[PDB]
Design an enzyme around this catalytic site. Structure first.
Site, PDB file in Angstrom:
ATOM      1  N   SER A 145       0.862  -1.215   0.000  1.00 39.43           N
ATOM      2  CA  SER A 145       0.000   0.000   0.000  1.00 39.43           C
ATOM      3  C   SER A 145       0.887   1.251   0.000  1.00 39.43           C
ATOM      4  O   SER A 145       1.647   1.379  -0.973  1.00 39.43           O
ATOM      5  CB  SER A 145      -1.073  -0.037   1.072  1.00 39.43           C
ATOM      6  OG  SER A 145      -0.535  -0.030   2.378  1.00 39.43           O
ATOM      7  N   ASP A 249      -8.398  -2.646  -6.473  1.00 42.18           N
ATOM      8  CA  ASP A 249      -7.800  -2.359  -5.147  1.00 42.18           C
ATOM      9  C   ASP A 249      -8.840  -1.660  -4.261  1.00 42.18           C
ATOM     10  O   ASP A 249      -9.452  -0.671  -4.715  1.00 42.18           O
ATOM     11  CB  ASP A 249      -6.524  -1.535  -5.275  1.00 42.18           C
ATOM     12  CG  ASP A 249      -5.780  -1.439  -3.959  1.00 42.18           C
ATOM     13  OD1 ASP A 249      -4.867  -2.254  -3.746  1.00 42.18           O
ATOM     14  OD2 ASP A 249      -6.139  -0.565  -3.153  1.00 42.18           O
ATOM     15  N   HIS A 298      -6.635  -5.859  -0.918  1.00 46.08           N
ATOM     16  CA  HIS A 298      -5.664  -4.810  -0.521  1.00 46.08           C
ATOM     17  C   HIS A 298      -4.459  -5.470   0.145  1.00 46.08           C
ATOM     18  O   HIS A 298      -4.657  -6.128   1.181  1.00 46.08           O
ATOM     19  CB  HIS A 298      -6.346  -3.795   0.405  1.00 46.08           C
ATOM     20  CG  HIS A 298      -5.498  -2.616   0.742  1.00 46.08           C
ATOM     21  ND1 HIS A 298      -5.026  -1.749  -0.224  1.00 46.08           N
ATOM     22  CD2 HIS A 298      -5.042  -2.156   1.929  1.00 46.08           C
ATOM     23  CE1 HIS A 298      -4.309  -0.804   0.355  1.00 46.08           C
ATOM     24  NE2 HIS A 298      -4.307  -1.031   1.677  1.00 46.08           N
TER      25      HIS A 298
END
Ligand SMILES: *[C@@H]1O[C@H](CO)[C@@H](O)[C@H](O)[C@H]1NC(C)=O
Ligand SMILES: Cn1c(=O)c2c(ncn2C)n(C)c1=O
Length: 353
Positions: A145, A249, A298
């Site tokens: 991320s 995502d 994610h």
């Protein structure tokens, strides 16, 4: 377990001026080093950084960090959990700068918070060189991320830093997981709860944010926010970078103001989601080392079950092994470019539950 080391250079700090640091598990047998950048969004003004300090303090301070962390997924030392790099020297660098690893600003009479993400990575590399990194063949800078975006922003600076310190033999590579975002139109327009482009524009000023030199030279003063978008910064990088990106995502959908409840999705949102997957797929067309499954998820690389996801019958650990083989000097049944073509989340049966 990886063991905590606080940086000996205590001028290199988390947001609150507490020392930054890294968790290390050495592998005496190995000349491979994996430096993993933790993620967890960002803050871009006093008010939203103050809120983050109340309820996400471990992402702004080392004061409450544990002495150890368990290595999971790509940071596991067990071949069963980590077929790829189980024997590597493992480093987990906690994200305590809230600046997508871009900041070069100290806490001072003018600054409530320190934003030192770029300098934390530099200082970790410098302090590891005395702990065995000096003997490395490969340094893989990985991250999930905000850590994935951090890889894109920092991998070439790590390469430059090692070249200038007299270690031209260490091969610096990047692994960017769930850090490949689109500056696309929101499904519905929306304060902090501010689209990434504007939040990053403000963040760079607030953080004294730094971006890779070639990207900076292309976009120039006031437009360096562009370099936080994978498809724009990636072509400017010299270091090999492997891009792991879910086509749908969850963080991308959140900033796009898409919220899937369970009700039938109507035409407008269906087309929006299909268009997003197609746009993501398009941006990866010319990325030779990539793993992009058609899933709503994610992060993946430090999840224990990261071995389970496959694209065209190839797992991510296998793709990464094929990438390693490709960087010796295409390989039969060892692909490195794996992008799903199916147009809807979970059209890939191996997607996370
Ligand atoms: C400590 O870190 C600061 C900020 O990155 C840097 O300017 C300085 O050279 C470092 N000092 C040492 C002794 O590493
Ligand atoms: C550009 N961008 C994003 O768009 C983003 C993000 N984290 C979440 N999003 C959605 N980061 C770190 C980022 O740099």
């Amino acid at each position: 377990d990886l063991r905590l080391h606080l940086l000996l250079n205590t001028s290199v700090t988390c947001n609150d001026g507490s020392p930054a640091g890294y968790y290390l598990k050495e592998s005496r047998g190995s000349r491979r080093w994996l430096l993993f950048l933790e993620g967890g969004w960002y803050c871009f003004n006093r008010e939203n950084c103050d809120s983050r300090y109340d309820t996400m303090r471990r992402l702004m301070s080392s004061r409450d960090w544990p002495r150890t962390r368990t290595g999971t997924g790509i940071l596991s030392s067990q071949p069963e959990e980590n077929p790829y790099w189980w024997n590597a020297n493992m480093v987990f660098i906690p994200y305590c700068s809230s600046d997508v690893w871009s900041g070069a600003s100290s806490k001072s009479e003018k600054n409530e918070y320190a934003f030192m993400g770029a300098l934390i990575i530099q200082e970790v590399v410098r302090e590891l060189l005395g702990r065995g990194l000096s003997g490395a063949k490969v340094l893989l800078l990985a991250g999930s991320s905000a850590g994935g975006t951090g890889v894109l922003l920092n991998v070439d600076r790590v390469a430059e830093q090692l070249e200038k310190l007299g270690y031209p033999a260490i091969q610096v590579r990047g692994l960017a997981d769930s850090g490949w975002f689109l500056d696309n139109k929101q499904y519905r327009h929306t304060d902090t709860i501010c689209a990434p482009t504007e939040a990053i524009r403000r963040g760079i000023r607030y953080w004294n944010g730094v971006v890779p030199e070639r990207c900076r030279r292309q976009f120039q003063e006031g437009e360096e926010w562009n370099c936080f978008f994978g498809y724009k910064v990636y072509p400017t990088l010299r270091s090999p970078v492997f891009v792991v990106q879910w086509l749908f995502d969850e963080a991308q959908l959140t900033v796009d103001n898409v919220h899937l409840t369970g009700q039938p999705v109507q035409e407008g949102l269906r087309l929006y989601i299909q268009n997003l997957g197609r746009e993501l797929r398009h941006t990866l067309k010319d990325v030779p080392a990539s793993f992009a499954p058609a899933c709503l998820s994610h992060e993946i690389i430090i999840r224990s079950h990261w071995t389970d996801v496959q694209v065209k019958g190839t797992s991510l650990p296998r793709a990464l092994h094929c990438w390693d083989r490709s960087l010796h000097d295409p390989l039969k049944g060892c692909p490195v470019h794996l992008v799903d073509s199916c147009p809807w989340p979970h059209c890939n049966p191996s997607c996370p539950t």
